[PDB]
Amino acid sequence: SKKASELPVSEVASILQADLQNGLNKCEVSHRRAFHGWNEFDISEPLWKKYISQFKNPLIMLLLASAVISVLMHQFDDAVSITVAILIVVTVAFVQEYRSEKSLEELSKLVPPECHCVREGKLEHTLARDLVPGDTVCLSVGDRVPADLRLFEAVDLSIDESSLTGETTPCSKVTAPQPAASRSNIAFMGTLVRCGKAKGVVIGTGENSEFGEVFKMMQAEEAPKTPLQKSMDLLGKQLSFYSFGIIGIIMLVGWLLGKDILEMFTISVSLAVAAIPEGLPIVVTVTLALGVMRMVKKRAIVKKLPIVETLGCCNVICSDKTGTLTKNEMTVTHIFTSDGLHAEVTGVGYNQFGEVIVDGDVVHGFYNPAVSRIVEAGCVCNDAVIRNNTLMGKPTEGALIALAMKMGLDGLQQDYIRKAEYPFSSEQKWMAVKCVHRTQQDRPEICFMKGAYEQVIKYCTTYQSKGQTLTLTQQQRDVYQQEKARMGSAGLRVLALASGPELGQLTFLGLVGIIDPPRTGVKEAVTTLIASGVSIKMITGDSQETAVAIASRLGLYSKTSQSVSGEEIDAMDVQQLSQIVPKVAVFYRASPRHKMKIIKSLQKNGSVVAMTGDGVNDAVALKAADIGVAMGQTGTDVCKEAADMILVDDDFQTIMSAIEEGKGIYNNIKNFVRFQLSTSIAALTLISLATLMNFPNPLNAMQILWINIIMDGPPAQSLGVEPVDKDVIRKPPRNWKDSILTKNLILKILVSSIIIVCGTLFVFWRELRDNVITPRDTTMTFTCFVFFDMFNALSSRSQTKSVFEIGLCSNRMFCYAVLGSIMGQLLVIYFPPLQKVFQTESLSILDLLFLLGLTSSVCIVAEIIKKVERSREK
Amino acid sequence: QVQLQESGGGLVQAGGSLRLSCAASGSIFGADWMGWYRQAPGKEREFVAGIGHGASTYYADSVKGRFTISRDNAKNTVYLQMNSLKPEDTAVYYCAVQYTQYRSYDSLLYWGQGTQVTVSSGS
Ligand SMILES: Nc1ncnc2c1ncn2[C@@H]1O[C@H](COP(=O)(O)OP(=O)(O)CP(=O)(O)O)[C@@H](O)[C@H]1O
Ligand SMILES: [Mn+2]
């Protein structure tokens, strides 16, 4: 690395076999690949680390402690049943997390880091893993580096240092070799280009690069727990502590009654295992993993887990105009000169193929000096280049070059050679270079400048009319302004071009009409999302009329809408900015600092924002948003790294689905919480009243363990898996607090638990009317509680819908788990060893039917009160 | 307005011959440019045929000579003749016809839906 850094580029190409302008032939590519290897360094453990990582959840430690407490008093079946419950919950958590991580890696593999490399001397699009040492690669603005790059030419190259060094300080690269951001001659793995263009050969790939150890370290860190995950860890711990208090009160009431110490210790350990939500963090992890799985199915790369839950709370979606709502395909269509003569331009694309026609006949070369001067100001000025009908740099600069190569003025791009340049910045809104003719070296250098029309007409001094140069006046500014407004209101992006001998001595030449089509599928999407209670906006760097027209064609702009500029948005303080910002749907002439200020102004109001943008201007605002979204086909790698979400199919129907699934996660969680809490309170109050009543306890410790498997295992994880509904999608977005245990939900939980307890007490007292103690009554109440539990599970399947209107075919896992619990209960009734270990004997068919109806009662009452609430809503 | 429907198109192997045909409902003598634009599967959009007001037929660099354009006025259906295309040169072939507007800065460019050409097997 350093030895090649102090080595000259010619000596570098002498040490390693390469051609400087023609790249490597594919035979030599395969020859270097057979020895050096691929770009991926070795391999990136699920069998051992991922399975053992689930056992450090605190509720899992406490259930393991209860199991080893049961081991200390040596009952085998209690300990193995607690361990079976623990094994099942960590198994489903591990398999869902593993599947989500594998699908995430598959989708991140599906998009490759693309490279613009000249393998055969022509511009080709290759991947990062296809690169071999010796290949020379062109670097674009906002491109991640393909390999360890040694650059032979660099007119203007800028390399960030935040990837490895961790510093946000800007850094530049020097073409001349340096003896001995350590060395600016050699480009580093992991960095990205923030500005400018350069070309360079590569010295090594894969393991042989020094900077692979930083990537090895960055893979080591685990994903931190989401605020939802910590919140429901708190909820599970507080439910555990409330159940512990209730069970301790039961044990004291039990001690006074004097019931056997060992049997009540088993019943209390069983009740503690049951009522604790061992499956609450596992069901939260299952919901998040399934949400990531759906995002992969919706073609979205989600880097971190909290994005899946913050998309459900989203109520404002900001965006950009080019690259997000318009496809960032730019082409010059109309030319208006400073003379007043107008030209219309032919063709679509970044092509050399088009016609420019004035007054009814075509113009080319140096036929008319105004349009030729405008076109020439559109080739030398652009840093970007067009090679083999492919766009390399930014899409607007290419449009003018496409126009420059349309009119027949390609070679002046090369003839002119620049010395010092003024780079384009989003805050600066203007571009400028001074270059000198190759053939006419005696002629002095002259500056060319392209930028926002207001800044351009501010900077230049004079104008051109009738082929003559005259000083700019106010009426000339007025005619140029009305013309610019006409281009903007027609829907044509405006670039104003001017030329002059020196900066500040420039002269205005005219305008170019750049059109960009709206991205297909955005208008119906934005209509749907606005109909779903979100407020999608438009943050733009372009003019008022362009952004307003594009928002109108897209339907973003109402008939009475307010649009605020950048100077006005930095004029207002934050509170009245927050007041005026929901009315605004079009922001324009906004710098990235303005975009960050809009994002923060909506963030102060409690509104969860989701910036969907593309650009290299400043991706810190994408980190400032609650959700960072970037596009895949036309998306620069800096905003892809900064994004919290990447969509590769580039339709606004997916960000729409992300909010839908983030909403449905909480509904599935509500189903789990309702079901488990209702049966936990039912069993707890059952044991509390009977132990207090002096009656024999209706359920045994093994029976409460089987009830725990029902209440926390796959019958409850099924309710955490249940697919979303379209009607609960149409509900407006919720606040940041989850607000899960609502008053209606707690009322429903108490109603279901009260019906379960009353039915169990009725059957228990009915079998105790003859005042004898037999296992018949305790298996009667065990079967009654188990059937009540599956009926309360079926009642918990949908919060706002009736149990019949949804259907059992929606959730296959619920049907499988219900059938499994029914068959396990019937084996407890029928199998004589299971009869001995559960203190159970067989029952009759009519008794089972009577229990089935008595437990259907809670489902009937549940659908009655849900229909009553729905009719009250109507 | 011009509504564009493409006829005689569909995927063909490398080395084959076929005649494209694009029907335009509107006039051609008032139009500025009758053009054919390619859209490669997975890549950007270029063109394959184009004739404008200046009577200069445009042939792309990949298909110079072997892709040819012919048209008349009364039939309102411009053709495109291609010979021996390449697998990298396959595309969904669009249609584009616009008029000459300087009062109205309108997008008179209308695209057709086109037809998809892709080479996979070779053989
Ligand atoms: N490379 C370039 N050289 C000169 N002017 C440029 C330019 N790129 C953009 N412009 C113009 O100068 C201004 C700078 O815009 P800016 O970069 O801040 O956002 P933008 O409009 O280019 C993309 P968006 O609207 O999505 O943010 C705009 O009016 C734009 O038309
Ligand atoms: Mn439990």
PDB file of N, CA, C and O in Angstrom, chain A residues 329 334 342 344 346-348 351-355 357 360-362 388-390 483 486-487 490 515 517, chain B residues 32-33 37 44-47 52-54 56 58-61 98-102 105-107 109 111:
ATOM      1  N   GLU A 329     -34.681  11.526 -15.006  1.00  0.00           N
ATOM      2  CA  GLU A 329     -34.305  11.510 -16.410  1.00  0.00           C
ATOM      3  C   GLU A 329     -34.520  12.913 -16.954  1.00  0.00           C
ATOM      4  O   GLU A 329     -35.653  13.398 -17.001  1.00  0.00           O
ATOM      5  N   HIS A 334     -36.517  22.846 -24.745  1.00  0.00           N
ATOM      6  CA  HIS A 334     -36.751  24.179 -25.280  1.00  0.00           C
ATOM      7  C   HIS A 334     -35.571  25.077 -24.938  1.00  0.00           C
ATOM      8  O   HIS A 334     -35.027  25.005 -23.834  1.00  0.00           O
ATOM      9  N   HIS A 342     -36.307  31.835 -30.069  1.00  0.00           N
ATOM     10  CA  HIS A 342     -36.582  30.618 -29.321  1.00  0.00           C
ATOM     11  C   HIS A 342     -36.273  29.390 -30.166  1.00  0.00           C
ATOM     12  O   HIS A 342     -36.535  29.370 -31.373  1.00  0.00           O
ATOM     13  N   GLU A 344     -36.656  25.018 -30.114  1.00  0.00           N
ATOM     14  CA  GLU A 344     -37.189  23.802 -29.521  1.00  0.00           C
ATOM     15  C   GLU A 344     -36.275  22.638 -29.880  1.00  0.00           C
ATOM     16  O   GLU A 344     -35.710  22.592 -30.978  1.00  0.00           O
ATOM     17  N   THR A 346     -35.214  18.421 -29.892  1.00  0.00           N
ATOM     18  CA  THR A 346     -35.810  17.149 -30.261  1.00  0.00           C
ATOM     19  C   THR A 346     -35.151  16.001 -29.511  1.00  0.00           C
ATOM     20  O   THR A 346     -33.923  15.963 -29.375  1.00  0.00           O
ATOM     21  N   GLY A 347     -35.968  15.070 -29.025  1.00  0.00           N
ATOM     22  CA  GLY A 347     -35.461  13.814 -28.514  1.00  0.00           C
ATOM     23  C   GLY A 347     -35.587  13.651 -27.017  1.00  0.00           C
ATOM     24  O   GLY A 347     -35.763  14.629 -26.284  1.00  0.00           O
ATOM     25  N   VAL A 348     -35.494  12.408 -26.553  1.00  0.00           N
ATOM     26  CA  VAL A 348     -35.513  12.089 -25.133  1.00  0.00           C
ATOM     27  C   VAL A 348     -34.321  11.190 -24.830  1.00  0.00           C
ATOM     28  O   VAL A 348     -33.997  10.289 -25.611  1.00  0.00           O
ATOM     29  N   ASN A 351     -28.619  11.396 -25.013  1.00  0.00           N
ATOM     30  CA  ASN A 351     -28.158  10.944 -26.314  1.00  0.00           C
ATOM     31  C   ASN A 351     -27.512  12.094 -27.072  1.00  0.00           C
ATOM     32  O   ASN A 351     -27.739  13.271 -26.780  1.00  0.00           O
ATOM     33  N   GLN A 352     -26.696  11.730 -28.063  1.00  0.00           N
ATOM     34  CA  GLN A 352     -26.163  12.666 -29.041  1.00  0.00           C
ATOM     35  C   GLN A 352     -27.091  12.863 -30.228  1.00  0.00           C
ATOM     36  O   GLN A 352     -26.656  13.400 -31.253  1.00  0.00           O
ATOM     37  N   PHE A 353     -28.341  12.437 -30.123  1.00  0.00           N
ATOM     38  CA  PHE A 353     -29.220  12.277 -31.274  1.00  0.00           C
ATOM     39  C   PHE A 353     -30.472  13.122 -31.075  1.00  0.00           C
ATOM     40  O   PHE A 353     -31.393  12.736 -30.350  1.00  0.00           O
ATOM     41  N   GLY A 354     -30.498  14.275 -31.731  1.00  0.00           N
ATOM     42  CA  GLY A 354     -31.623  15.188 -31.646  1.00  0.00           C
ATOM     43  C   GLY A 354     -31.430  16.332 -32.612  1.00  0.00           C
ATOM     44  O   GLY A 354     -30.371  16.489 -33.226  1.00  0.00           O
ATOM     45  N   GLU A 355     -32.482  17.132 -32.741  1.00  0.00           N
ATOM     46  CA  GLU A 355     -32.525  18.255 -33.664  1.00  0.00           C
ATOM     47  C   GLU A 355     -32.885  19.526 -32.909  1.00  0.00           C
ATOM     48  O   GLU A 355     -33.694  19.506 -31.979  1.00  0.00           O
ATOM     49  N   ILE A 357     -34.342  23.251 -33.926  1.00  0.00           N
ATOM     50  CA  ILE A 357     -34.992  23.920 -35.047  1.00  0.00           C
ATOM     51  C   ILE A 357     -35.456  25.299 -34.598  1.00  0.00           C
ATOM     52  O   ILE A 357     -36.135  25.428 -33.573  1.00  0.00           O
ATOM     53  N   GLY A 360     -38.719  27.371 -37.966  1.00  0.00           N
ATOM     54  CA  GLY A 360     -39.162  26.486 -39.025  1.00  0.00           C
ATOM     55  C   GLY A 360     -38.068  25.788 -39.806  1.00  0.00           C
ATOM     56  O   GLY A 360     -38.379  25.134 -40.809  1.00  0.00           O
ATOM     57  N   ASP A 361     -36.802  25.910 -39.408  1.00  0.00           N
ATOM     58  CA  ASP A 361     -35.733  25.117 -40.004  1.00  0.00           C
ATOM     59  C   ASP A 361     -34.669  24.832 -38.952  1.00  0.00           C
ATOM     60  O   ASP A 361     -34.551  25.537 -37.947  1.00  0.00           O
ATOM     61  N   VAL A 362     -33.888  23.779 -39.200  1.00  0.00           N
ATOM     62  CA  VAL A 362     -32.953  23.279 -38.200  1.00  0.00           C
ATOM     63  C   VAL A 362     -31.715  24.170 -38.137  1.00  0.00           C
ATOM     64  O   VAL A 362     -31.400  24.919 -39.065  1.00  0.00           O
ATOM     65  N   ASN A 388     -20.531   6.220 -24.526  1.00  0.00           N
ATOM     66  CA  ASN A 388     -21.239   5.081 -25.124  1.00  0.00           C
ATOM     67  C   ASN A 388     -22.730   5.093 -24.788  1.00  0.00           C
ATOM     68  O   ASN A 388     -23.312   4.069 -24.422  1.00  0.00           O
ATOM     69  N   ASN A 389     -23.334   6.281 -24.903  1.00  0.00           N
ATOM     70  CA  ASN A 389     -24.767   6.511 -24.679  1.00  0.00           C
ATOM     71  C   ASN A 389     -25.198   6.143 -23.259  1.00  0.00           C
ATOM     72  O   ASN A 389     -26.343   5.742 -23.032  1.00  0.00           O
ATOM     73  N   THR A 390     -24.288   6.272 -22.296  1.00  0.00           N
ATOM     74  CA  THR A 390     -24.574   6.037 -20.888  1.00  0.00           C
ATOM     75  C   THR A 390     -24.214   7.280 -20.085  1.00  0.00           C
ATOM     76  O   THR A 390     -23.176   7.905 -20.324  1.00  0.00           O
ATOM     77  N   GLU A 483     -40.363  34.628 -18.938  1.00  0.00           N
ATOM     78  CA  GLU A 483     -40.047  33.440 -19.728  1.00  0.00           C
ATOM     79  C   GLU A 483     -39.691  32.259 -18.832  1.00  0.00           C
ATOM     80  O   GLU A 483     -40.171  31.142 -19.059  1.00  0.00           O
ATOM     81  N   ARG A 486     -42.762  30.907 -17.332  1.00  0.00           N
ATOM     82  CA  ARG A 486     -43.509  30.115 -18.305  1.00  0.00           C
ATOM     83  C   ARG A 486     -42.927  28.711 -18.456  1.00  0.00           C
ATOM     84  O   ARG A 486     -43.682  27.727 -18.514  1.00  0.00           O
ATOM     85  N   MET A 487     -41.589  28.599 -18.521  1.00  0.00           N
ATOM     86  CA  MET A 487     -40.965  27.274 -18.557  1.00  0.00           C
ATOM     87  C   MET A 487     -41.303  26.477 -17.305  1.00  0.00           C
ATOM     88  O   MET A 487     -41.611  25.282 -17.387  1.00  0.00           O
ATOM     89  N   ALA A 490     -44.995  25.390 -17.233  1.00  0.00           N
ATOM     90  CA  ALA A 490     -45.209  24.310 -18.189  1.00  0.00           C
ATOM     91  C   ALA A 490     -44.696  22.978 -17.658  1.00  0.00           C
ATOM     92  O   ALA A 490     -45.130  21.919 -18.125  1.00  0.00           O
ATOM     93  N   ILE A 515     -36.820  18.858 -19.200  1.00  0.00           N
ATOM     94  CA  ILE A 515     -38.038  18.179 -18.779  1.00  0.00           C
ATOM     95  C   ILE A 515     -37.663  16.885 -18.071  1.00  0.00           C
ATOM     96  O   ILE A 515     -36.668  16.231 -18.413  1.00  0.00           O
ATOM     97  N   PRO A 517     -39.976  13.475 -16.643  1.00  0.00           N
ATOM     98  CA  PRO A 517     -41.308  12.894 -16.487  1.00  0.00           C
ATOM     99  C   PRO A 517     -41.544  12.464 -15.052  1.00  0.00           C
ATOM    100  O   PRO A 517     -40.603  12.041 -14.363  1.00  0.00           O
TER     101      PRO A 517
ATOM    102  N   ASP B  32     -42.965  16.985 -35.855  1.00  0.00           N
ATOM    103  CA  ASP B  32     -41.572  17.397 -35.951  1.00  0.00           C
ATOM    104  C   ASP B  32     -40.645  16.206 -36.169  1.00  0.00           C
ATOM    105  O   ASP B  32     -39.694  16.293 -36.952  1.00  0.00           O
ATOM    106  N   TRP B  33     -40.908  15.090 -35.492  1.00  0.00           N
ATOM    107  CA  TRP B  33     -39.949  13.994 -35.428  1.00  0.00           C
ATOM    108  C   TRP B  33     -40.677  12.695 -35.130  1.00  0.00           C
ATOM    109  O   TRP B  33     -41.310  12.561 -34.079  1.00  0.00           O
ATOM    110  N   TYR B  37     -37.523   4.576 -29.967  1.00  0.00           N
ATOM    111  CA  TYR B  37     -36.629   4.618 -28.819  1.00  0.00           C
ATOM    112  C   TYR B  37     -36.585   3.260 -28.139  1.00  0.00           C
ATOM    113  O   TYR B  37     -37.626   2.691 -27.803  1.00  0.00           O
ATOM    114  N   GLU B  44     -30.897   1.532 -19.353  1.00  0.00           N
ATOM    115  CA  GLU B  44     -31.479   2.832 -19.674  1.00  0.00           C
ATOM    116  C   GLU B  44     -32.078   2.862 -21.076  1.00  0.00           C
ATOM    117  O   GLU B  44     -32.042   1.855 -21.792  1.00  0.00           O
ATOM    118  N   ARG B  45     -32.632   4.009 -21.483  1.00  0.00           N
ATOM    119  CA  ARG B  45     -33.281   4.148 -22.784  1.00  0.00           C
ATOM    120  C   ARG B  45     -32.379   4.909 -23.752  1.00  0.00           C
ATOM    121  O   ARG B  45     -31.851   5.977 -23.425  1.00  0.00           O
ATOM    122  N   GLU B  46     -32.192   4.330 -24.935  1.00  0.00           N
ATOM    123  CA  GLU B  46     -31.537   4.902 -26.101  1.00  0.00           C
ATOM    124  C   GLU B  46     -32.563   4.931 -27.234  1.00  0.00           C
ATOM    125  O   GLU B  46     -33.762   4.739 -27.007  1.00  0.00           O
ATOM    126  N   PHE B  47     -32.112   5.180 -28.459  1.00  0.00           N
ATOM    127  CA  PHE B  47     -33.034   5.083 -29.579  1.00  0.00           C
ATOM    128  C   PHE B  47     -32.505   4.091 -30.609  1.00  0.00           C
ATOM    129  O   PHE B  47     -31.341   3.685 -30.573  1.00  0.00           O
ATOM    130  N   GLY B  52     -36.481  13.416 -38.537  1.00  0.00           N
ATOM    131  CA  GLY B  52     -37.003  14.685 -38.070  1.00  0.00           C
ATOM    132  C   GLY B  52     -37.435  15.643 -39.160  1.00  0.00           C
ATOM    133  O   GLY B  52     -37.701  15.235 -40.294  1.00  0.00           O
ATOM    134  N   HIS B  53     -37.509  16.931 -38.812  1.00  0.00           N
ATOM    135  CA  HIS B  53     -37.949  17.942 -39.768  1.00  0.00           C
ATOM    136  C   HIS B  53     -36.898  18.181 -40.845  1.00  0.00           C
ATOM    137  O   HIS B  53     -37.238  18.477 -41.997  1.00  0.00           O
ATOM    138  N   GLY B  54     -35.621  18.044 -40.498  1.00  0.00           N
ATOM    139  CA  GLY B  54     -34.535  18.334 -41.409  1.00  0.00           C
ATOM    140  C   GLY B  54     -34.207  17.253 -42.410  1.00  0.00           C
ATOM    141  O   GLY B  54     -33.177  17.355 -43.084  1.00  0.00           O
ATOM    142  N   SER B  56     -33.071  14.328 -42.017  1.00  0.00           N
ATOM    143  CA  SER B  56     -31.848  13.616 -41.668  1.00  0.00           C
ATOM    144  C   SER B  56     -32.235  12.429 -40.797  1.00  0.00           C
ATOM    145  O   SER B  56     -32.531  12.597 -39.608  1.00  0.00           O
ATOM    146  N   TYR B  58     -31.839   9.416 -38.417  1.00  0.00           N
ATOM    147  CA  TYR B  58     -30.893   9.155 -37.346  1.00  0.00           C
ATOM    148  C   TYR B  58     -30.836   7.662 -37.070  1.00  0.00           C
ATOM    149  O   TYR B  58     -31.866   7.016 -36.849  1.00  0.00           O
ATOM    150  N   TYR B  59     -29.623   7.118 -37.136  1.00  0.00           N
ATOM    151  CA  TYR B  59     -29.336   5.725 -36.831  1.00  0.00           C
ATOM    152  C   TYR B  59     -28.362   5.710 -35.663  1.00  0.00           C
ATOM    153  O   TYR B  59     -27.386   6.467 -35.656  1.00  0.00           O
ATOM    154  N   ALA B  60     -28.627   4.861 -34.673  1.00  0.00           N
ATOM    155  CA  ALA B  60     -27.787   4.838 -33.485  1.00  0.00           C
ATOM    156  C   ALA B  60     -26.439   4.185 -33.785  1.00  0.00           C
ATOM    157  O   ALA B  60     -26.263   3.486 -34.787  1.00  0.00           O
ATOM    158  N   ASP B  61     -25.477   4.434 -32.891  1.00  0.00           N
ATOM    159  CA  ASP B  61     -24.101   3.997 -33.110  1.00  0.00           C
ATOM    160  C   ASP B  61     -23.960   2.482 -33.058  1.00  0.00           C
ATOM    161  O   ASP B  61     -23.122   1.916 -33.768  1.00  0.00           O
ATOM    162  N   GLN B  98     -43.863  13.713 -31.993  1.00  0.00           N
ATOM    163  CA  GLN B  98     -44.290  15.006 -31.476  1.00  0.00           C
ATOM    164  C   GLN B  98     -44.430  15.988 -32.630  1.00  0.00           C
ATOM    165  O   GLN B  98     -43.856  15.802 -33.707  1.00  0.00           O
ATOM    166  N   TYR B  99     -45.211  17.038 -32.396  1.00  0.00           N
ATOM    167  CA  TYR B  99     -45.367  18.137 -33.338  1.00  0.00           C
ATOM    168  C   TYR B  99     -44.400  19.267 -32.996  1.00  0.00           C
ATOM    169  O   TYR B  99     -43.618  19.190 -32.045  1.00  0.00           O
ATOM    170  N   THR B 100     -44.453  20.319 -33.808  1.00  0.00           N
ATOM    171  CA  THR B 100     -43.802  21.583 -33.500  1.00  0.00           C
ATOM    172  C   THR B 100     -44.839  22.519 -32.889  1.00  0.00           C
ATOM    173  O   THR B 100     -45.860  22.815 -33.519  1.00  0.00           O
ATOM    174  N   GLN B 101     -44.586  22.968 -31.664  1.00  0.00           N
ATOM    175  CA  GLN B 101     -45.518  23.847 -30.973  1.00  0.00           C
ATOM    176  C   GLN B 101     -45.536  25.237 -31.602  1.00  0.00           C
ATOM    177  O   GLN B 101     -46.557  25.674 -32.131  1.00  0.00           O
ATOM    178  N   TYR B 102     -44.069  29.919 -30.726  1.00  0.00           N
ATOM    179  CA  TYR B 102     -43.340  29.521 -29.528  1.00  0.00           C
ATOM    180  C   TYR B 102     -44.183  29.742 -28.266  1.00  0.00           C
ATOM    181  O   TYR B 102     -43.679  29.684 -27.149  1.00  0.00           O
ATOM    182  N   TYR B 105     -45.367  26.038 -24.306  1.00  0.00           N
ATOM    183  CA  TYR B 105     -44.206  25.245 -23.894  1.00  0.00           C
ATOM    184  C   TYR B 105     -44.621  23.837 -23.478  1.00  0.00           C
ATOM    185  O   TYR B 105     -44.203  23.326 -22.444  1.00  0.00           O
ATOM    186  N   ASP B 106     -45.422  23.183 -24.311  1.00  0.00           N
ATOM    187  CA  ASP B 106     -46.081  21.948 -23.920  1.00  0.00           C
ATOM    188  C   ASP B 106     -45.243  20.740 -24.306  1.00  0.00           C
ATOM    189  O   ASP B 106     -44.513  20.763 -25.301  1.00  0.00           O
ATOM    190  N   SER B 107     -45.360  19.684 -23.509  1.00  0.00           N
ATOM    191  CA  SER B 107     -44.719  18.411 -23.815  1.00  0.00           C
ATOM    192  C   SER B 107     -45.572  17.704 -24.856  1.00  0.00           C
ATOM    193  O   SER B 107     -46.472  16.931 -24.521  1.00  0.00           O
ATOM    194  N   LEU B 109     -44.346  15.536 -26.777  1.00  0.00           N
ATOM    195  CA  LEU B 109     -43.766  14.204 -26.861  1.00  0.00           C
ATOM    196  C   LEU B 109     -44.731  13.197 -26.241  1.00  0.00           C
ATOM    197  O   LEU B 109     -45.009  13.253 -25.039  1.00  0.00           O
ATOM    198  N   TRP B 111     -45.294   8.995 -25.898  1.00  0.00           N
ATOM    199  CA  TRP B 111     -44.671   7.689 -26.070  1.00  0.00           C
ATOM    200  C   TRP B 111     -45.726   6.615 -26.291  1.00  0.00           C
ATOM    201  O   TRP B 111     -46.837   6.701 -25.759  1.00  0.00           O
TER     202      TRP B 111
END
